[PDB]
């Protein structure tokens, strides 16, 4: 497992430097194996996208259980606790983010994995404080939801990583951006 | 014009390396040494500057053809605004890259940024008018416009890998930026 793990932390640094074109070669080479291993572990190319996206969320879920609470709470606490913990995934972790950003996008991502990565946060249970936009957008629209999300989220990183004085501002702002986006709703004559 | 050249150049490098681009390589794929390139421009800050207001005023250019003003709506203003930056990147993606680069680099003079307000007032009204004053204010203006970019590219980059749905994207990113930075009833 010890060879699968460094051949994830490879994939992990193509993917953030070059998207999906990343090479198999190049990712099994940086792992030190030849791409025939590689080949073995996944057996293609999707599969190890859809395993990554995976193992890196896994990856976020961990940093964040230590200080993981009960449903019974506000839902923009709950949402700002999870935006808080990716910025600090991101800045600790940035090739993480910077690949678990380039699968999100891929059009690549099989519903088990979606199922899957769903399961990895109870969180992900709308109850509406969503508004009317982004449960249809969750519907039809759900990778291009997600770019925005970490649009936003990144932007959020490379300010604060920039100027650290200012990151929890920054952090702030940009939470507050991304929920009036997720939760803001339409107002009628 | 040489001086035009060197801009395009200084436009794909920063493209693609940001602010860091050698002065180097926009003057090498101009088709000068670097001399000429720092003669037009006597510093990197200063070619900076130049640049982004050679770019600001290509997008006025394609924004106020555009334009009707019997729309008052400011939500109406800005979507049409925002069809309007969204199709300029879509057209000029390397004008669109190096804009964003050069927006939140943090080498814009205060001359630069008024006279690039100066190229479309009515959009800086617009946006006295219905942004958030954080966005708007002197210390987080910079944070805005990269929160603004960032969604603007998203779009961007969604609508051109699947152009059949593009004018959702579109729709849907003006939404999400306009709930995220606007101010409310």
Same mark, same amino acid.
């Given at each position: 497992?010890?060879?699968?793990?460094?051949?994830?932390?490879?994939?992990?640094?193509?993917?953030?430097?070059?998207?999906?074109?990343?090479? /198999?070669?190049?990712?099994?080479?940086?792992?030190?194996?030849?791409?025939?291993?590689?080949?073995?572990?996944?057996?293609?190319?999707?599969?190890?996208?859809?395993?990554?996206?995976?193992?890196?969320?896994?990856?976020?879920?961990?940093?964040?259980?230590?200080?993981?609470?009960?449903?019974?709470?506000?839902?923009?606490?709950? /949402?700002?606790?999870?935006?808080?913990?990716?910025?600090?995934?991101?800045?600790?972790?940035?090739?993480?983010?910077?690949?678990?950003?380039?699968?999100?996008?891929?059009?690549?991502?099989?519903?088990? /994995?979606?199922?899957?990565?769903?399961?990895?946060?109870?969180?992900?249970?709308?109850?509406?404080?969503?508004?009317?936009?982004?449960?249809?957008?969750?519907?039809?629209?759900?990778?291009?939801?997600?770019?925005?999300?970490? #649009?936003?989220?990144?932007?959020?990183?490379?300010?604060?990583?920039?100027?650290? #004085?200012?990151?929890?501002?920054?952090?702030?702002?940009?939470?507050?951006?991304?929920?009036?986006?997720? /939760?803001?709703?339409?107002?009628?004559?």
């Amino acid at each position: 497992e010890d060879k699968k793990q460094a051949l994830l932390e490879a994939a992990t640094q193509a993917i953030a430097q070059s998207g999906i074109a990343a090479s /198999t070669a190049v990712i099994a080479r940086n792992a030190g194996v030849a791409e025939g291993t590689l080949f073995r572990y996944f057996a293609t190319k999707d599969e190890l996208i859809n395993t990554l996206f995976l193992h890196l969320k896994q990856d976020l879920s961990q940093s964040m259980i230590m200080e993981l609470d009960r449903s019974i709470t506000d839902a923009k606490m709950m /949402t700002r606790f999870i935006w808080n913990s990716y910025i600090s995934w991101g800045l600790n972790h940035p090739a993480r983010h910077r690949a678990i950003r380039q699968l999100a996008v891929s059009e690549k991502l099989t519903k088990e /994995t979606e199922q899957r990565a769903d399961d990895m946060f109870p969180e992900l249970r709308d109850l509406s404080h969503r508004s009317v936009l982004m449960v249809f957008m969750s519907d039809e629209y759900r990778a291009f939801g997600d770019g925005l999300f970490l #649009a936003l989220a990144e932007t959020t990183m490379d300010f604060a990583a920039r100027d650290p #004085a200012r990151a929890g501002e920054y952090i702030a702002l940009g939470f507050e951006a991304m929920w009036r986006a997720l /939760t803001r709703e339409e107002q009628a004559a």
